[PDB]
Amino acid sequence: GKSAFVFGRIHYISDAFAFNTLDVEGLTRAVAEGCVDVFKEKEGIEYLVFLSSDLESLVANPKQLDRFLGWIDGLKKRGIEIINVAEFIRKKVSNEYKSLPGECSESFRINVKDYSSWSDYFDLSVDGRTSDMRWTGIRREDNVVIHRWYKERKVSQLWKFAFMKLFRELNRAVRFGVIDMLRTQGVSDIEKIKEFLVR
Amino acid sequence: MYMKFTYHFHAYQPGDIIYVHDGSGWDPIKYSERLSPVALEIREEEVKGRNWTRAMIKAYEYVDETLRMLDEGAVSVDFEPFTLYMVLKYKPKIYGEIVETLETHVEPTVTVPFHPIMPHLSHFEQEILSKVSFDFYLPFIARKPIVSFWLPENVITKDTAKIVTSATDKDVVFLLDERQFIGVNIPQARFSCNKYLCDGKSAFVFGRIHYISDAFAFNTLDVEGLTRAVAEGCVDVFKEKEGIEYLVFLSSDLESLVANPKQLDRFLGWIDGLKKRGIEIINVAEFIRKKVSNEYKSLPGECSESFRINVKDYSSWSDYFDLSVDGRTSDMRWTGIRREDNVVIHRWYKERKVSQLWKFAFMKLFRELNRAVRFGVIDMLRTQGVSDIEKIKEFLVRYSRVFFREHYEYFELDTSVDYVMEPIHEADPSLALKLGRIYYLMLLANHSCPRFWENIDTRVTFGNVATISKALIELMELYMEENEERANYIFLEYMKLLAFPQLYYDYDLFRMKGLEGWETTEKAWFESLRSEVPNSKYNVVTRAALYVGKRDLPPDMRSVIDTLYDLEEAVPDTGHIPGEMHGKWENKEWCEHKGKD
Amino acid sequence: MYMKFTYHFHAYQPGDIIYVHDGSGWDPIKYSERLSPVALEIREEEVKGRNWTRAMIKAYEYVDETLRMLDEGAVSVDFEPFTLYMVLKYKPKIYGEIVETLETHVEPTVTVPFHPIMPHLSHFEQEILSKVSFDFYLPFIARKPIVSFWLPENVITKDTAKIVTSATDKDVVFLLDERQFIGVNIPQARFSCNKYLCDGKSAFVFGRIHYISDAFAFNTLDVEGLTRAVAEGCVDVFKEKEGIEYLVFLSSDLESLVANPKQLDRFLGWIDGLKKRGIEIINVAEFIRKKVSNEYKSLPGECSESFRINVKDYSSWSDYFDLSVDGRTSDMRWTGIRREDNVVIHRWYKERKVSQLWKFAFMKLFRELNRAVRFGVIDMLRTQGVSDIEKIKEFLVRYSRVFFREHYEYFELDTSVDYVMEPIHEADPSLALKLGRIYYLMLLANHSCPRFWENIDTRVTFGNVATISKALIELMELYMEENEERANYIFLEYMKLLAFPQLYYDYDLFRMKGLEGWETTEKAWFESLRSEVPNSKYNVVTRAALYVGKRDLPPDMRSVIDTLYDLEEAVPDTGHIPGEMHGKWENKEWCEHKGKD
């Protein structure tokens, strides 16, 4: 019905910062060199390297704030402009930034895998993509229940499925309660109840 | 750097055969070639040939001189067998230089005779071709425990991989394109030593990066851009810090080194640029050996069955990627059909859209012709007391020593009649060697090339059809000698070539769905078949079938084609192959044949 | 009793045509017939003919005399159009008697010209045949608001039912077999006035009881047993108490009335026995009318869309029921394939098992030949300015007035060239009427009969092939006159008949699975094709194609078949049809052709 823009982070560089597995030189090179699009540099076409992490990664260790500042500084020194995903798109559509033919349009539509995530147990992926098995305890591709290591023992993740399922039922019990009781008060329009719950 | 780099080059020419001469089958085939003068510019020199094949064979000498400038073991090369054979026959000095290079200086890579799409052949043909590939390459690979292998257009399926790996005791490395990998994403698998399960055994696999390979091959990045794309764009910052070697693997046609006059120097400059960046140039097999030997450091499990990845069946290195719906390649280029939604595609040619439906019909017809020939061989050998299909297979593999005799003899390998006939020694060699010739003409007729291009009317389509017509008429005539009804079973097959346009109806192609909705109409089919040359009103398939038939058919059958067709319009002239337009042709409007001698 | 009873008889002869004579297409076809003397015993009399068709036409007079002994409106009868036409030409007095009976005494039932399996034809052919069926029957059905309809072998699909019902404004009653019903069990639906949705409109349906019908037709129960099976075995105790009329409907070939010498008297005795039990004999259409008029009492909803039942697509009245896996019939008898598990079946013939794979190939080949003819007609009419496919369809329907001219003229219906050419009056009638002839020879060639029997080598298979060969050679020659390349598109089609055994390979029949596991092997295929006559070494398809080709092919093409084949072995002799063995044949070992005159 509508179409959305989409950007996908690079997991391995994002986590390299967030979990302190590469120094500032390494992070700078991983981006400035590792992500270079030589064709777009030639054609003078802007492209966006987009990374993401929890904000709390900035205090995951006492040096994270300086590391991040040094990283961004390293990139600017490479001639890399730091610019947010929205202002990036805005600068594209405005044609302040040159584009490929069809860029930021509905011919540049890509797909996204249903139930994929940014933080799933990737070591169990069978398609090289992510899923939601971490929160359900079930790998969908072969419909099996997984286990994980915890304090030296393997633990079934079956409890997550039950937890999730139970809450679907509690959630509905509460929602129907609200609707049933508001009905007694002479409120029949479910859309008015929705607007209320929103307000 | 811990990054290593290598390049693989694949060399192949379909040849310029327009009419195979009659022969007994006891010797390699002889033939008439197209006369279509053309020249290639290499640096400041012009290299001229009487046809494209002969121009390119001369060019191969310049390529070899350039490969000799590289360090030992830097790159790998496969030469398609009949291509190397044509070099041997035409310019044995050039063959000598190339084989010396393959022996000592570059890693030799095994590939299939006649460059068919392997998963578009029956298992029986694939089996014979796989065994012949390793035999033909014996002089270059005899002592090697691991060998790399080049499937034509890198079109692979698990079944085809099983046939190939079953045909040798060596470990195989398949050279592929990274867009073929599945069950892992591209960055996740990149540059590591991965393996691939082909059932009974596993193979190593490496996948090229097409955008960098093509930036070289089609001259869209300068040497500095190529150097940057590799040294920077491919860096693995983690492996650099861990001191773990990884391989950036690229591949192109060997002929890309003469795609324009500066290619040879661009390539040398690129390699020099990488070496100066601290990147060692090391071929795929040596890279694996160093990982396996622990001379290089590995990720846990690297180079073992723990590092298995999957490859998409029917994927390739050269598909029409702009039509991909899964981010991977397929074989739609050669079949005319996108598998994911089962639709017949179109492509542009001379600024009009042309349905690719003809490719499906051509492929399907050849599957049928191939079996008619194979079953004819099996049937006639049965009449000679040979009933064991495995002995027949052995004979057909050994017959490559007749077909490529001078190559095996160059390397002091036995090509004698007694060697070739050994598995079927109860059979009359006059009949058996004729059947071997017929079988090999059929194999030669399965070049993938016609289906690579958007337009049917090319010299390679003419060649495939003229070659299979030779085989069919000879097989028909063997059955006539027996006073057999089966002779007309074979005439039926030849009639399907002559009456190629009728296959739209007979194959029910009207039932298929076009991508845009018009590609499977009668109008789209017939328009796709229109002649591209003014001196023939017939489509190229009919044209070639007539060209051979008017020479070879028995008199009654010749009178039939003389009545139905204007035989003066059966000429070898065809449309040009778009990829050959960089040549300096005497006739650049179409692919001529000068017929005065 | 409230029970009502009726019988339906279906009359059809494939004919004995062995070679159609050349003709312009302006007149009905003329032809040479098989000379194979045979006699039928009816009561104490012998009825003799020069061939089976002519013997049976004489027999029809005895059948008519017996039907005239029944009460008015008791039974229904369909006569296949060309069968009735052959009666008219050979014995017009017998045709007169039959048509008088159809006009006044029995309910006339519409059926399709040439008795093809309708769901085994393309929609286009089915459409033409459906429209012709109602036109041909105009003299018998013009004033009727409801008409019964006989699909050959009762093979039906919802799509075919839609084509048939769309071809008339009348309500249709389909006469079927109760083993065809689905979505209801047999006792649940039995004897009621049910309907059937064929999309836009609905039809009435009645399903025969095969075991009682066959007990009569094959003489396995005496008259008292037949009477009991109906009056007792079919009683609906509830409807008897409720006073609700119900119809026990049975059906057989009309020729079952001469399957042995006592059949006619058995039938009359059976009807007499039922009437004495209080059972009124009333044809299907009259039964429906009485329900609809409320002269009879109905269950709530009876005879309306409320009483809809379903019919299994591809079910029939005569399938190999011993191989059924769902308790219903199918079309495996004619295709050679059981649909439920997709396997190729075998049957017994002369105490050996014979694969039915040949039936699939024969069916598939004819689908292709049919289209080649139809597209040739459409293409050649296009060259005459006729582009509207609907006008072409109208012309092909009106052409039945040429093909069956004497029948329409008997009933004072317009058969003039101006009437027939009206929808395509811009076209040259010399060409158009030749194309109409060619199209109708193709239709005539689609008799279902060859595929009914277990063995390919029969006079009906010979006839179908000889007839389609005539059409193809004529169409080829029309294209030759235009100096067209398309002439060899048609020669290809004829070559597929000549080289019929090669279709095992070309149709990839080796990929199919046999029921027992051997039915799809090469050995099974070739054994199935072996000649059943000592004076021809060729399979019956090749034999017939040669028989016509040696007479009709242009001289160059005749020389080709003269070189590849022994034309003295192209004779019309074939194996016998198992169902004709009750006849007294001059040669009972095979179906001869005496060729001296």
Sign of CA dihedral C174, C177, C182, C187: positive
Sign of CA dihedral B175, B181, B184, B190: positive
| Exposed e or buried b per residue across C72-89, where buried means at least 16 C-beta atoms within 10 angstroms of its C-beta | ebbbbbbbbbbbbbbbbe
**B480 contacts in C (CB within 8 Å)?**
563-564
Q: Give the minimum alpha-carbon distance from C525 to chain B in angstroms, rounded to a whole number.
A: 15
Q: Containing H/E element for B563?
A: helix B555-564
**B556 contacts in C (CB within 8 Å)?**
556, 559-560, 562-563
Q: C381: exposed, middle or buried (C-beta count within 10 Å: 0-12, 13-18, 19+)?
A: buried
| Whether residue C116 is found in the same domain as residue C128 | yes
- Please give the tally of structural domains in chain C: 2
Q: Name the H helices within B404-539.
A: 405-410, 417-421, 429-444, 459-481, 486-498, 503-506, 522-528
Sign of CA dihedral A108, A114, A116, A121: negative
- Asked whether B293 and B92 are in contact (CB, 8 A), the reply is no
Q: Give the minimum alpha-carbon distance from B368 to chain C in angstroms, rounded to a whole number.
A: 6
- Asked whether B447 and B14 are in contact (CB, 8 A), the reply is yes
Q: Taking the mean position of all CA atoms in its chain, how far away is CA A48?
A: 16
**B328 contacts in A (CB within 8 Å)?**
none
| Whether residue C72 is found in the same domain as residue C161 | yes
Q: Give the minimum alpha-carbon distance from C38 to chain B in angstroms, rounded to a whole number.
A: 34
Contact C559 B564 (CB under 8 A): no
d(CA C52, CA C58): 10
Phi-psi region of C508 (alpha: psi -120 to 50; beta: other; left: phi over 0): left
| Whether residue B506 is found in the same domain as residue B590 | yes
Residue given tokens 């811990």 in the structure block: B2
Among the partner-chain residues A21, A33, A127, the one whose CB lies closest to the CB of B232 is A33
**B182 contacts in A (CB within 8 Å)?**
127-128
Q: B496: exposed, middle or buried (C-beta count within 10 Å: 0-12, 13-18, 19+)?
A: buried
Give chain A's end-to-end CA distance (angstroms, integer): 26
Residue C31, CA distances (Å) to B138, C136, C470 in order: 69, 22, 11
Query: Dihedrals φ, ψ of B301, to 5°?
Result: 90, -15
Nearest CA to A48 out of A40, A59, A57 is that of: A40
Contact B556 C559 (CB under 8 A): yes
Tokens of C76: 């229904």
- Asked whether B457 and B540 are in contact (CB, 8 A), the reply is yes
When scoring C538, C564, C567 by the number of chain B Cβ atoms within 10 A, the one with the most, hence best to mutate, is: C564
Q: Give the minimum alpha-carbon distance from B270 to chain A in angstroms, rounded to a whole number.
A: 15
- Asked whether B282 and B72 are in contact (CB, 8 A), the reply is no
Nearest CA to B78 out of B140, B166, B17 is that of: B140
Does the beta carbon of C387 lie under 8 angstroms from any beta carbon of chain B? no
Contact B499 C506 (CB under 8 A): no
CB pairs under 8 A between A and B: 51
A63: helix, strand or coil: coil
Q: Where are the beta strands (DSSP E) in B304-382?
A: 310-311, 337-338, 343-344, 346-349, 352-355
Q: Give the minimum alpha-carbon distance from B233 to chain A in angstroms, rounded to a whole number.
A: 5
| Amino acid (one-letter) located at C376 | G
Contact C499 B505 (CB under 8 A): no
Contact A34 B185 (CB under 8 A): no
Among the partner-chain residues B184, B220, B225, the one whose CB lies closest to the CB of A128 is B184
Tokens of B459: 């010299």
Phi-psi region of C342 (alpha: psi -120 to 50; beta: other; left: phi over 0): left
d(CA C128, CA C166): 12
| Whether residue C113 is found in the same domain as residue C251 | yes
Give chain C's end-to-end CA distance (angstroms, integer): 61
When scoring A15, A28, A31, A38 by the number of chain B Cβ atoms within 10 A, the one with the most, hence best to mutate, is: A38
Tokens of C326: 């769902």
**Nearest-10 Cα torsion for B255, B256, B257, B259:** 100
| Whether residue C348 is found in the same domain as residue C409 | yes
d(CA C210, CA C324): 15
Residue given tokens 């350039």 in the structure block: B66
Beta-bridged to residue C146, according to DSSP, are C171
Tokens of C523: 């050995």
Nearest-5° Cα angle at A86, A85 to A92: 90
**A30 contacts in B (CB within 8 Å)?**
235, 237
d(CA A64, CA C576): 96
Q: What is the CA radius of gyration of chain B?
A: 24
Does the beta carbon of C371 lie under 8 angstroms from any beta carbon of chain B? yes
Nearest CA to C8 out of C77, C71, C66, C69 is that of: C77
- Asked whether C35 and C50 are in contact (CB, 8 A), the reply is yes
Q: Give the minimum alpha-carbon distance from B200 to chain A in angstroms, rounded to a whole number.
A: 22
| Whether residue C42 is found in the same domain as residue C67 | no
d(CA C395, CA C402): 11
d(CA C362, CA C450): 9
What method did the depositors use to determine the structure?
X-ray
**A34 contacts in B (CB within 8 Å)?**
232-233, 235-237
d(CA C300, CA C298): 6
- Indicate the DSSP class of residue B184: S
Tokens of A11: 């997991």
Among the partner-chain residues C371, C489, C498, the one whose CB lies closest to the CB of B488 is C498
Q: B237: exposed, middle or buried (C-beta count within 10 Å: 0-12, 13-18, 19+)?
A: buried
Among the partner-chain residues C375, C488, C563, the one whose CB lies closest to the CB of B564 is C488
Closest-CA residue in chain A for B226? A38
Residue B86, CA distances (Å) to B64, B463, C168, C296, C484 in order: 16, 15, 70, 91, 40
d(CA B331, CA B153): 9
C285: helix, strand or coil: helix
Tokens of B109: 């890579």
Nearest CA to C467 out of C402, C548, C359 is that of: C548
Could you list the residue range(s) of the whole structural domain that residue B38 is in?
A: 15-55+333-597
Beta-bridged to residue A150, according to DSSP, are A153
Residue C24, CA distances (Å) to B345, C17, C402, C469, C480 in order: 45, 18, 11, 17, 16
Furthest-apart CA atoms within chain C: distance in Å: 78
Does the beta carbon of C105 lie under 8 angstroms from any beta carbon of chain B? no
Does the beta carbon of A26 lie under 8 angstroms from any beta carbon of chain B? yes
- Asked whether C180 and C207 are in contact (CB, 8 A), the reply is yes
| Amino acid (one-letter) located at B57 | I
Residue B468, CA distances (Å) to B21, B358, C393 in order: 13, 18, 42
| Whether residue B7 is found in the same domain as residue B30 | no
Query: What count of other Cβ atoms lies within 10 Å of the Cβ of residue B383?
Result: 12
Closest-CA residue in chain A for B231? A33
Among the partner-chain residues C506, C556, C562, the one whose CB lies closest to the CB of B560 is C556
| Whether residue C124 is found in the same domain as residue C255 | yes
- Asked whether C335 and C360 are in contact (CB, 8 A), the reply is yes
Nearest CA to B284 out of B215, B191, B184, B197 is that of: B191
Which residue among B277, B310, B331 closes a domain? Answer: B331
Nearest CA to A35 out of A70, A9, A62, A61 is that of: A9
Does the beta carbon of C238 lie under 8 angstroms from any beta carbon of chain B? no
| Whether residue C363 is found in the same domain as residue C503 | yes
Closest-CA residue in chain B for C497? B492
Q: Give the minimum alpha-carbon distance from A35 to chain B in angstroms, rounded to a whole number.
A: 6
- Indicate the DSSP class of residue A96: S
| Amino acid (one-letter) located at B570 | A
**C511 contacts in B (CB within 8 Å)?**
none
The subunits that touch chain A, with at least 3 C-beta pairs less than 8 Å apart, are: B
Beta-bridged to residue B7, according to DSSP, are B250
| Exposed e or buried b per residue across C495-504, where buried means at least 16 C-beta atoms within 10 angstroms of its C-beta | bbbbbbbbbb
CB pairs under 8 A between B and C: 86
Residue given tokens 């429906």 in the structure block: C288
| Amino acid (one-letter) located at C469 | S
Nearest CA to C254 out of C97, C39, C67 is that of: C67
- Asked whether C588 and C52 are in contact (CB, 8 A), the reply is no
Does the beta carbon of B567 lie under 8 angstroms from any beta carbon of chain C? no
Does the beta carbon of B496 lie under 8 angstroms from any beta carbon of chain C? yes
**Nearest-10 Cα torsion for C133, C139, C141, C144:** 150
Residue given tokens 């890279």 in the structure block: B287
d(CA C67, CA C80): 18
| Whether residue C176 is found in the same domain as residue C160 | yes
The subunits that touch chain C, with at least 3 C-beta pairs less than 8 Å apart, are: B
**B372 contacts in C (CB within 8 Å)?**
502, 505-506
Which residue among C267, C301, C331 closes a domain? Answer: C331
Query: Dihedrals φ, ψ of B349, to 5°?
Result: -150, 120
Does the beta carbon of B211 lie under 8 angstroms from any beta carbon of chain A? yes
| Whether residue C232 is found in the same domain as residue C342 | no
Closest-CA residue in chain A for B214? A39
Residues found in chain A: 199
Does the beta carbon of C526 lie under 8 angstroms from any beta carbon of chain B? no
| Whether residue C290 is found in the same domain as residue C420 | no
Q: Please report the resolution in angstroms.
A: 1.8
